[PDB]
Design a protein around this ligand. Sequence first.
Ligand code: FAD
Ligand code: FAD
Ligand code: CL
Ligand code: CL
Lengths: 656, 652
Amino acid sequence: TKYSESYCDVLIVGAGPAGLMAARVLSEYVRQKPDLKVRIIDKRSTKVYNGQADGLQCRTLESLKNLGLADKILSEANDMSTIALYNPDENGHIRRTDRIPDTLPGISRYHQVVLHQGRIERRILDSIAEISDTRIKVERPLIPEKMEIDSSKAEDPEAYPVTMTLRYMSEDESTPLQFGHKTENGLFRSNLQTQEEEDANYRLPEGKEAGEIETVHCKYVIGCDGGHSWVRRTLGFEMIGEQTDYIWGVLDAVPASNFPDIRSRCAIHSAESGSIMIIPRENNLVRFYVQLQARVDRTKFTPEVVIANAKKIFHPYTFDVQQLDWFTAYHIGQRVTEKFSKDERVFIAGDACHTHSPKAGQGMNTSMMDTYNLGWKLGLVLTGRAKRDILKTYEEERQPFAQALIDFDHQFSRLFSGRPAKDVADEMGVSMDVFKEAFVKGNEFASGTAINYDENLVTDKKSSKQELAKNCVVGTRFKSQPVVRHSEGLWMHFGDRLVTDGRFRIIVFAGKATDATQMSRIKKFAAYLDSENSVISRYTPKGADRNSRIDVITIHSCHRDDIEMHDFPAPALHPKWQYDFIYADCDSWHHPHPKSYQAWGVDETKGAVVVVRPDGYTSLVTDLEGTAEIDRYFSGILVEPKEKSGAQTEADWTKS
Amino acid sequence: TKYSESYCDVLIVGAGPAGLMAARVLSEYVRQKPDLKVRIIDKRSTKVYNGQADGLQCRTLESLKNLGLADKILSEANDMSTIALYNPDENGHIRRTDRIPDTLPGISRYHQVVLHQGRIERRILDSIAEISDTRIKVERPLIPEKMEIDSSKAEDPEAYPVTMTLRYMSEDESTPLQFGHKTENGLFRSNLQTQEEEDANYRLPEGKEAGEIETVHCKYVIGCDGGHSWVRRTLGFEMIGEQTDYIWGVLDAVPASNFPDIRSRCAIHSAESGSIMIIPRENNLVRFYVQLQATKFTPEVVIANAKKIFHPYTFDVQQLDWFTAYHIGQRVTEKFSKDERVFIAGDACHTHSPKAGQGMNTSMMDTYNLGWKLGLVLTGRAKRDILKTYEEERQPFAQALIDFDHQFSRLFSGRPAKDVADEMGVSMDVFKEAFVKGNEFASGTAINYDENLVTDKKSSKQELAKNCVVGTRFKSQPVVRHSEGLWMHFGDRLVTDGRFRIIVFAGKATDATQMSRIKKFAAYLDSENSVISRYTPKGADRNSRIDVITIHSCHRDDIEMHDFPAPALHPKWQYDFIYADCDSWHHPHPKSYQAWGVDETKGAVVVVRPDGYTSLVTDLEGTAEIDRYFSGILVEPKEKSGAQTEADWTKS
Ligand SMILES: Cc1cc2nc3c(=O)[nH]c(=O)nc-3n(C[C@H](O)[C@H](O)[C@H](O)COP(=O)(O)OP(=O)(O)OC[C@H]3O[C@@H](n4cnc5c(N)ncnc54)[C@H](O)[C@@H]3O)c2cc1C
Ligand SMILES: Cc1cc2nc3c(=O)[nH]c(=O)nc-3n(C[C@H](O)[C@H](O)[C@H](O)COP(=O)(O)OP(=O)(O)OC[C@H]3O[C@@H](n4cnc5c(N)ncnc54)[C@H](O)[C@@H]3O)c2cc1C
Ligand SMILES: [Cl-]
Ligand SMILES: [Cl-]
C-alpha cells in the first residue's frame, strides 16, 4: 500500500449531477485564482452506466443557460409538451379524459425537456474542462474511508479543518452488480439497495491490500454522494421519512404500440392493475414508469415482469418493445435531512439530503440547483471575495426547499400509485379530479421557478421597497423578460445577459431617461457609482474592469430612436467601447413593445434599482436614491480587495 | 515524375463554400450508395481561417437548417438587426437620418446573420465527415493542369466523358493565407479547436507525393474554383461585365470608436470622402467596408480613409483579424454547363460587390440546387435530363444578382447629392429605396423558377394553395405536431436528403365528406401503380423516396392520428407525419393554412422538391397530375414496392 498526503481547498465526493454542477460552478473561481485546488472523486467505474435521470425543469434550464450549457442540451432533448390523463370509464377501459400542459404557459422561456443523463453529464464535463482549462478532472475510482473534522478550526481561513482519508480502489471494486440481467440496468443504485449493501459492495475484500491510502487535508468538503451518502451518515445527520410497499419499474424503450398518446407525457390509472407514467424521449425512445403488483429479489426483477404489467395497464391498447436500452426498479418513499452542513465546512447536497419518487422528475434538478446555490458562495469565500458567514445561507435556503419537495412528492406519489375511485362513493380510491388538480399545481412547484428564499445575509427584504419592482420579489429568481439591446436593436431575452460567473448585478431600471427630471436622478446615481466609496469603487480591485465584480446594467423605457447610449453617464452606465450594458423596453422590427417594465412591475417613468445575486436571485429592490441600502447590502457580504479601484477617473469616452 | 490514373463519379474543383456545399449535398448519396466516388480538391494547403465571406441570408439559413447546419452556425453568428443610414446635413456633417430592418419582417423565420467563412467551412467540413463517414475528404493542395471532354459520350451513363489531369503540389507552391490559423491559449482544446489545428497543417492525401500527376477519368466535374475559375476559363465561358474604378478596403477589427451605431449595420455616405458600410460581427468584431480615394494597399491606408469618412466621430482599431481590397465590378456567364457533364457554380459563374453579402449565399445555393439533381442521377433514381434545369434555374438568378448589384454598388459608391439639383450625386431617398427593395432580393427567398422539367406550373391548380406558388420555396409556417402537441416550424421537418415531399393538406378531416376524399387519396397512395408504390424500391420504407406528410386543420383534441389512413398517412410506429394547424399550450392558432393560402376545409396537395421548392399544386383528386409529374423525373427501381399490403397497425 502506498501512503500519501496532500492538501486541497475543496473536495467534492461524488460526480453525479450535484457533484458535477459543483465542479462546474467552482471551475470559474479556479480559473480566476489558479492556485485554488478543487478535486472531485467518484467510487464507480464508467463501464456500467451510472445514471438514471432524464428530465430538466425550467429553472434548471435557465441556470444552465447562464452557464453556457442550455443550447447544447436543447439541441438533443425532447419537449414532452403535453400531459395526457387516462383513467377508467364505466367498463373499466382506460381512455383520455383530459390534457394539461407539461410546462405551465408563461412560467419561463424554457420548457421542461428530457434527455439521457449521460448526455447531460457529457455537456457539463466538457464545460468543466473548458472553464478549468482541463485542471479539474474527475478522479476515479476513489472512496473515503475516514473523515475527521476539527470544529475548533472552523473559522480559521488558513486552516484545513477536514481530514479525508481516501482509498484508491481496484476496477473490480468499482464495478456495480447487474444481477444476471442481460439488459443494462440501474438496480444497483435503486432504493431497493440498502445502505449496508452499498457500503459492502465497494469494500476492500478480505485478504487484499489497498493500492493507495491518501490523507487529504481539506478546507471544505461537499458530499454529493447519493441517497445512501457515506458523508451524511458519517456526519450523523438523520433522515426522516418512511418507504412504502409500492413498487415501480422503468423501461427505456423504443415502443411498438397503438396507444394514441405514446409520444406524449401521460399518466395512466388502470382500473385494478396500477399506474403508468409515459415520458417520451429523444431518438424514438420512450421511458415508461410502470407500477408493479405489490425485500424484492433483484435477480427476479426482469424486463419481462415489467412489460407484463405494462400490457395489463395499457389494456386494451397494445404494448410491445422494439428495443430495450435500460431498465430499473424503485419503491415509493421520501426522506430528507434537517441539516445540510457541519461547521459550514462539510456540506451535503442532492440525493444525500433528499430522496423521493421520480413522478415529477425532481431529483437531478434539485441536486444541481443545490450546488449551483452552494458553489458561488464557496467560490467567493475561497477567493477572499466574501465573508464566510454567507455559507450559512446554503442550509437556510436549500433545506426548507428540500422539505417542500418531500411534502409535494409525498402526496403526488401516493395519488399516482393509488387505485382510481370508481365513483364518488369509492372512498378508498383516488379521485381523478384531485389528481389532475395536484398535477396542475405541482407543475408550478416542479418548474423550480416559484422558490422564494427567506430573508438572510444575502437576501434583503427589510431594506427593500418592494413596490418599486412588484414582480421582482426579493428572494425569488430574477425572471427574464424580452428587451431590445440598444447598440443594434437586437430583441433578446434579458436572462441571457445574466451569465453566471461569480458577479452580482445591479439592474438599473433607468425609466424615462428622455425626461430631464428622470435623467437628473440617473446622473446622481451614476455619480454615486463613480464615487470613491461606492460598491463599484471599493469592491473592484485596482486595475480591474469596473463591471468585473458587480455588473451594472441599464434597462430604460425609451425607444432607441429617441435617446442614444451616449446620452447615459459614461463610463458608469455606458462603459468604454463596450455594448452589452444598455437595453430598452421598446418596440422593435420583429416584435411589438414587450411591456417588460410592466411584467417586472416597475414604473415606466421612475424606474427602480434591483440587485441580483450571482445565482440569479433578486436580493434587494430600491430606488435610484437608495445608495445607502445598496451600500449596506454589499458591506454585509463582500470583502474589500487589498488595493481598490477607488473613484472613477476616466473622462467620458464618448466626447474623447 | 510519378504518374497515376484513376476513376471517379464526381470531381469537385475548389473547396470554398460552393464546393463544400456540393460535397455536403452529395455526401448523402454516397452514404446510400457507397460504391459512388466523389472527390473534392483545392489548390490551397488549408481551409480559410478568417475573413472573406461572412453573410448568411434567410433562404441560405433555411437550407442550412434542412442540412443540420443552422443551429451550430447560429450559436456563433451575429444578427445585425438594424441598418442605420447616415449621410451629410446642409453643413456636410454626417447624421443618422433613418433606420430600416436588416431583415424584412415576416420574410422568413430566420434573420440574416454574419460569421466568417472559416467557421462556415469548419461546420460544413464536419457535416461532410459525419454524413459521408469520412468517405469524402478534401484533397489539398492539388490543382488541375488539363481537362478533356468527349462530347460524343455525354449521354452514355457508363462513360467517363471528362478526363482531368491533376498535379499534387508541394507546400512551398501553395499560396498561403495572410491571416491563417492561430493556436488557442491554454491547455484545453474542444473537438472543434482540435480539428481546426489539424486542418492547419500541410498534408497531401495518404500515399501521394508532391509532383505526382494523376489522370482522373470523371463522369462529372463541378468547377467551384472561385472568381478566376480555371474550369470556367478552360470551358471558354466568357465572364461578361465591366469593372469600375471604385476601390474599397475591408477591415475585420475590434473597433475603438464613439460612433453611436458602431454595433449596428450602417451605411455612411460622407460629404466628400467616400462611403462606409459597417457589418457588426461576432465576438466584438466589426467588419468595415471602406471606400478608398485614389502600388500596394495596406490596412493603414484603409484606416486613414475610414477616419476621414467617420469624421467627426473617432475610429481606431484595437485588433485586426483580416483585411483585403477590391474593385467594384460585376461579371456573369451565359452558360453554367458543358454537356451537363462539366458544371460551374459560385463565384466561377458570377462576381459582384459585397454590399449585400451575396457571394457565399448565392454560391452555396447554386450547389444546393445542382447537388440533389446530380445525386439522384448518380444513384440511378432520376433521368439525366433533370440536369438541364440547373442552368435554367441558376443562370437567370445570377443575372438578376448582377443587375441588382450593378445599381446598388454604384449608389453605395457615389457622392451623396448636396441638394436636389446635385445630379452628379446620389439621392439618399433613392438609396434608401434601393436598400429596402434590395433586402427582399438579398434574402434569397423571392426566387421564382420558370416552369421546367421539375417545376410544373401548367398542371397545377395554383388557387388551391395561393401562397405556395409553384417555383418558389415552400415557406415554413408553424404547426402543432399531433403526436405530443409540440409547436414547431414545419420547415424543420423538410430535412434535405434527396426525398421529394407530398404535403397533404387534409383540411377539415373530422368532416365526413372531407375524410372520404382523404381516404380515396390514401387508396391511390396504396395502389399498385401509385408514385409511392412505383418509386419506392421493394423492401424499402414507403416514405424513403417520396415523403408523404399530412397537415390537417383540426385541433388535436378533436381527431386522432389513428383516424387517418394507416399506414399510408399514419405510418407504423412512426410519429413525424401528422401535424395540425391549431391552438397549442404556448401559442395561439398559427393560422398557417391561411398563411399558405389553402382552404381550411378542402385543403390541397402540394409537391415539394428535394431542395424545398414547390413543384406542383393540386387537389386530392389530382393523382393523375402527380403521376405525370414524377414520371418525367424519376426512374423506377428494378424491383418496386408495389401495392401496400400491410394491415392497419392501429387496429390491434
Ligand atoms: C428511476 C429514476 C428516474 C429519475 N428521473 C429523474 C428525472 O427525470 N429528473 C430529475 O431531475 N431527477 C430524476 N431522478 C432523480 C435523480 O436520479 C437523483 O435525484 C439525482 O441523480 C441525484 O443526484 P446526486 O448527484 O445528488 O446523486 P447521485 O446521482 O446518486 O450521484 C452520486 C455519485 O456519487 C458516487 N458515490 C456514492 N458514494 C460514494 C462514495 N462513498 N465515494 C465516492 N463516490 C461516491 C456515485 O457513484 C455517483 O456517481 C430519477 C430517479 C430515479 C430513481
Ligand atoms: C480574397 C477574397 C476576399 C473576399 N472578400 C469578401 C468580402 O469582403 N465580402 C464578401 O461578401 N465576400 C468576399 N469574398 C467572396 C466570397 O468569399 C465568395 O463569394 C464565397 O466564398 C463563395 O465563393 P466560392 O465558394 O464560389 O469560391 P471561393 O470562396 O473563392 O473558393 C474557391 C476555392 O477554390 C480553390 N481554387 C481556386 N482555383 C483552384 C484551382 N485551379 N484548383 C483547385 N482549387 C482551386 C480556392 O483555393 C478556394 O478554396 C472574398 C473572396 C476572396 C477570394
Ligand atoms: Cl447555452
Ligand atoms: Cl441545424
